[PDB]
Amino acid sequence: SFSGYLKLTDNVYIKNADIVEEAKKVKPTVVVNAANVYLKHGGGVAGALNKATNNAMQVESDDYIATNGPLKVGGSCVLSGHNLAKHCLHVVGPNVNKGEDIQLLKSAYENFNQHEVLLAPLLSAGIFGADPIHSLRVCVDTVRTNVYLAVFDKNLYDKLVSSFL
C-alpha cells in the first residue's frame, strides 16, 4: 500500500513523488487525473498518466467525450485506471491560465469525497496556473476521505510542507 508519506491531517498525506511511478507501484483503487473538460491529456499530470497507459486513457476518454460531451470545470468522471489503478477519477480543476474561476477549486476537490481513498495530484497546480499552497489548503479543508498527494517537484514539496499550517 502507500509508503513514505508525510501525514498533514487526519486524512491528507503528501509525498514528493512522480504520480505515474507511484500509481505503478501501489496500483491504487483510484488515481486522480488533473483533467481538462475535453479529457485531452496533452501535458502535465494528464499527459504523463496517459503516456503511461500507452494512450489507452486518451482512446477511452475520446469515446467518453463523443458519448457524453465535455465535463464541467469543477466536475469529474470515473474511467478505467488501465495499468495504473483500478479507476481513474478525471477531475477538472479551474485553469487560471485559461481565465477560469479559482472558486471552482473547492467544487473540484469535492469529487474526491465520493472515493474512500485516492492517489492524487494537487488540483489546478502546475500548468493549470493556481498557487499550489492554496490548492493544498483547499484540499485539506474540502476532502474528508483519505487522499495521498503526490507532488512531483521536490522544491515545491518542501515549500508545501514547510509552509503548511
Q: Is 160 helix (H, G, I), strand (E, B) or coil?
A: helix
Cβ burial, residue 68 (10 Å; 0-12/13-18/19+): exposed
CA pair distance 100, 7, nearest whole angstrom: 31
CA dihedral 116, 19, 158, 140 (to 10 degrees): -20
CA pair distance 87, 81, nearest whole angstrom: 4
Q: Report the side by side order of strands in the sheet with 30-34.
A: 6-7, 12-16, 146-151, 117-120, 30-34, 87-91, 76-80
**How was this one solved?**
X-ray
Give kind and range of the element (H or E) at residue 148: strand 146-151
Q: How far is CA 139 from CA 7, 39, 42, 64, 70, in A?
A: 14, 22, 24, 27, 24
Provide the 10 A C-beta neighbour count for residue 69: 10
Bridging pattern class, strands 146-151 and 117-120: parallel
